[PDB]
Amino acid sequence: YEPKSVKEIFIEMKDTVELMVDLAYASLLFGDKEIAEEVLELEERIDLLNYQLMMHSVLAARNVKEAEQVITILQIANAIEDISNAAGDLAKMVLEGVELHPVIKETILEGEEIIGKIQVYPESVIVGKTLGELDLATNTGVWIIAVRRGKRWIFGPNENFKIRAGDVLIGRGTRTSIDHLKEIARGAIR
Amino acid sequence: YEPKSVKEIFIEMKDTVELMVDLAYASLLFGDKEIAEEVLELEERIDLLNYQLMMHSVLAARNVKEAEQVITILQIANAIEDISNAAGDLAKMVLEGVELHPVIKETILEGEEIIGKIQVYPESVIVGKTLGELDLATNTGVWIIAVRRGKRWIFGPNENFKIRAGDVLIGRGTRTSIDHLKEIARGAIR
Ligand SMILES: [Ca+2]
Ligand SMILES: [Ca+2]
Ligand SMILES: [Ca+2]
Ligand SMILES: [Ca+2]
Ligand SMILES: [Ca+2]
Ligand SMILES: [Ca+2]
Ligand SMILES: [Ca+2]
Ligand SMILES: [Ca+2]
Ligand SMILES: [Ca+2]
Ligand SMILES: [Ca+2]
Ligand SMILES: [Cl-]
Ligand SMILES: [Cl-]
Ligand SMILES: [Cl-]
Ligand SMILES: [Cl-]
C-alpha cells in the first residue's frame, strides 16, 4: 500500500468538517434525515482520520524538536474534531425529528452565507458539464455541497460529477450568489 | 431601546462563528497574534449573544408548546458555541507563539477552500469601490474576512467598506478563485 502523508490526512479532515457543518445546516433547513445520516457517517470518518493523524505523528517524531512540531498538528486536529462533534449534534436533532422553531430555517436562508436548493432545467448551459469543467466554486462563488438526483444523494461531489437536467443542487453561498446560479440553472442566463 | 429579535441574535451568532473559524485559520497561516486576539474577542461576543438568546427564549415561551420550540434554538446555539470555543482554541496556539509544523500553513493554502492575501494596486478597478457596490462574495466567490490597511486591521468589513490601493485583502475561497481576484487586484483584469 502507498503511505498517506500527514498533510493529506490533515487536509481531508479540514475539508470534511467544513462539508459536515454545511450539510448539518442543510439537514436542518430541509428537515432531511438522510443528509443528517451523512453528517454522522462523516463524523466517523473524522474519528478515523484523527486516529491516522495520531499514528503518523507518533511514528514520525523521535526527538524533542520533531515531537513539539507534530504536537501542534494534533492540537489543531483536536479542535477540528470538536467542530465535527458539534455538526453531529445538529444532525442528531434532525434524526430525533424534533419540530424546529421557524426562525431556524429562516436563519439558514437569511445569513451572510446561505444554503440554497437549485433546480437544473434541460435548457441550462451547465447540463452535461462536470463540476471541474465548471469549477462552480471558482466561477460562481456557489459551492456545491450535495446533489439530489432522483431517489439518490451525492454528497460532496467531486470534479468529475457531470450535471444532468432534473438534478437538484444544494449550494452554499451568498443570497445573490444563489439566485445568480438559479438563473443559469433555469437557462435564463447562457 | 429597540428590542432585538431571536432571529437577529441567532443570525449574528452563526455569521460570527463562521468568521471566527476563518480568522482562526488566518491567524495560523500568518502567525498573526492580532488576528488571534480578534478571534478571542469574538468568542466573548458569542458568549454575550448566547446569553441574549437564552434571555429571549426564556421570556418568549410561557407554555409547553412554545417552550419545546425555543429549546430547539438553544440546542443549536449550544453547538454553535462549541464551534466558537474550538476557533478560540486555535487562536490561543498563535498567542502562545508555538512553532507550527510546516504542514499547517501548507494545509490552509492547499485545501478545497483556502485563505489568501491579496495586494491591491492603484490601477485596479476595485479601488474606490465598496464591498457592497462590489459584492465580491457574490461576484467573485472570494469572501473578504479582513483587510490590513497600514498599521490597522478591519475585521469582517461591512458593505460600506471602500477599498484603497495598498490594502491587503484577506480572502477565503478556492485557489483559482483567489488567483482570479489577485489578477483583478493587480489591474491585469479590468
Ligand atoms: Ca469524534
Ligand atoms: Ca515516535
Ligand atoms: Ca474536546
Ligand atoms: Ca434513496
Ligand atoms: Ca430531480
Ligand atoms: Ca463560550
Ligand atoms: Ca417563560
Ligand atoms: Ca459544550
Ligand atoms: Ca496597529
Ligand atoms: Ca498596505
Ligand atoms: Cl502531500
Ligand atoms: Cl441531462
Ligand atoms: Cl428579524
Ligand atoms: Cl486609493
| Selected residues 2-31 of chain B with any CB under 8 Å from a CB in chain A | 6-7, 10-11, 14-15, 18, 21, 28
Alpha-carbon distances of A20 from A61, B159, B175, rounded to whole Å: 30, 29, 21
Whether residue A140 and residue B141 make contact (CB cut-off 8 A), yes or no, is: yes
Rounded distance, CA B161 to CA B138, Å?
A: 16
Rounded distance, CA B126 to CA B118, Å?
A: 12
How close A26 gets to chain B, by Cα (Å)?
13
Which grid coordinates belong to B155?
A: 475585521
In this structure, what is the dihedral angle of CA atoms A82, A141, A146, B109, given to the nearest 10 degrees?
A: -40
Note residues around ion ligand 9 (Cβ under 5 angstroms): B 151
Rounded distance, CA A101 to CA A12, Å?
A: 34
Q: Which residues of B touch A21 (CB under 8 A)?
A: 83
| Cα angle: B75, vertex A112, A10; to 5 degrees | 70
Ligand 3 centroid, distance to A74 Cα (angstroms) = 12
Q: Tell me the one-letter amino acid at B190.
A: R
Convert A7-54 into a string of H (helix), E (strand) and C (coil): HHHHHHHHHHHHHHHHHHHHHHHHCCHHHHHHHHHHHHHHHHHHHHHH
This structure was determined by X-ray
Strand order in the sheet with A168-173: A114-119, A168-173, A143-149, A152-155
CA-based nearest residue to B32, from B120, B111, B100: B100
B167 and B140 Cβ atoms separated by less than 8 Å: no
How close B186 gets to chain A, by Cα (Å)?
18
Rounded distance, CA A38 to CA A152, Å?
A: 12
Rounded distance, CA A89 to CA A101, Å?
A: 17
Which grid coordinates belong to A44?
A: 466517523
Please indicate if the annotation marks B151 as binding a ligand: yes
CA-based nearest residue to B170, from B70, B27, B49: B27
Ligand 2 centroid, distance to B1 Cα (angstroms) = 60
Architecture of the CATH domain B110-190: 2-Layer Sandwich (3.30)
Overall size of chain A counted in residues? 190
Q: Which of B15, B43, B112, B133 to mutate to test the interface with A (most CBs of A within 10 A)?
A: B112
How close B142 gets to chain A, by Cα (Å)?
7
Whether residue A89 and residue B68 make contact (CB cut-off 8 A), yes or no, is: no
| Pairs from A60-64 (Cβ < 8 Å, separation ≥ 24) | A60/A6
Convert chain A into a string of H (helix), E (strand) and C (coil): CCCCCHHHHHHHHHHHHHHHHHHHHHHHHHCCHHHHHHHHHHHHHHHHHHHHHHHHHHHHCCCHHHHHHHHHHHHHHHHHHHHHHHHHHHHHHHHCCCCCCCHHHHHHHHCCCEEEEEECCCCCCCCCCEHHHHCHHHHHCCEEEEEEECCEEEECCCCCCECCCCCEEEEEECHHHHHHHHHHHCCCCC
B88 and B45 Cβ atoms separated by less than 8 Å: no
Q: Which residues of B touch A14 (CB under 8 A)?
A: 107-108, 111
| Bridge partner residues of A119 (DSSP) | A168
**A131 reaches B (C-beta below 8 A):** no
Rounded distance, CA B183 to CA B190, Å?
A: 9
Q: Which residues of A touch B108 (CB under 8 A)?
A: 14
Rounded distance, CA B88 to CA B24, Å?
A: 7
Looking at the CA of A163, which ligand is closest? 12
In sequence order, the 6+-apart residues with CB closer than 8 A to the CB of A89 are B75, B78, B79, B82
How close B35 gets to chain A, by Cα (Å)?
17
Rounded distance, CA A37 to CA A95, Å?
A: 8
In sequence order, the 6+-apart residues with CB closer than 8 A to the CB of A159 are A130, A131, A132, A133, A135
Element (H, E) at B94: helix B64-95
Sequence ranges of the domains in chain A: 1-109, 110-190
| Residue from the list A68, A75, A76 with its beta carbon closest to the beta carbon of B99 | A68
CATH 3.30.43.10 for the A1-109 domain, yes or no: no
Please check whether the two domains, A1-109 and A110-190, share a CATH topology.
no
**B52 reaches A (C-beta below 8 A):** no
| Chain B residue nearest residue A22, CA to CA | B18
